[PDB]
Amino acid sequence: VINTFDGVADYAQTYHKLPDNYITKSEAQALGWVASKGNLADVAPGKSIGGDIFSNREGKLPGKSGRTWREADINYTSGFRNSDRILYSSDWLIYKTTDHYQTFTKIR
Template sequence: MSLLCSTLSGKTAGTATKIGLRGADWWLKTFRQLPGYYITEDEASKLGWIPILANLVSVAPGKMLTKGVYKNRDKRLPDALGRIWYEADIHYSFGYRGGERILYSNDGLIFVTYDHYATFVEIV
């Protein structure tokens, strides 16, 4: 793990989110895809989601957002030629989105941040 990412110990897949084997960390590690309860911002918007109203739970109950490509501009996550990072919310239940995210790459790396990108913990 890169020193830029975090000095925190890694977490085992299935323990990084509050919902265990239904969590994004487990699904990404096991199936290399997000669970079916994730939708894109475009899909949420088509359902009536308006971010400033924090109404995702009312227009898309049980859903969480996947944000698409994460730029990794500051290179705090491991960088490699051809690597693309993606991000998705974790632990959303209602209201405004919190700062907890899962970040995953096209080549199988997975990290979580519980403090809106201040620190990252690798999922192993």
């Protein structure tokens, strides 16, 4: 697998977690992922990067006391990472970005 915008948005709002095919950046690194070589598919077959906290430093996503944001890669299959991400809050608002976190739009 579930790696589409609708597939993971509906799965996260329902189960309140990411599907089994996601791994954190540090989990991927421990397994041998080298970002400069775009080898994720070779060292962790069937997996995508997801679940890391997104700081939202630049304040583009709506804030609230106690709300924290997490991100997940969408549409990834192999090669270097793409620029599609799903942003989900602790209160399950879901936003999408297709331009490397430049802009976001609400999807759930």
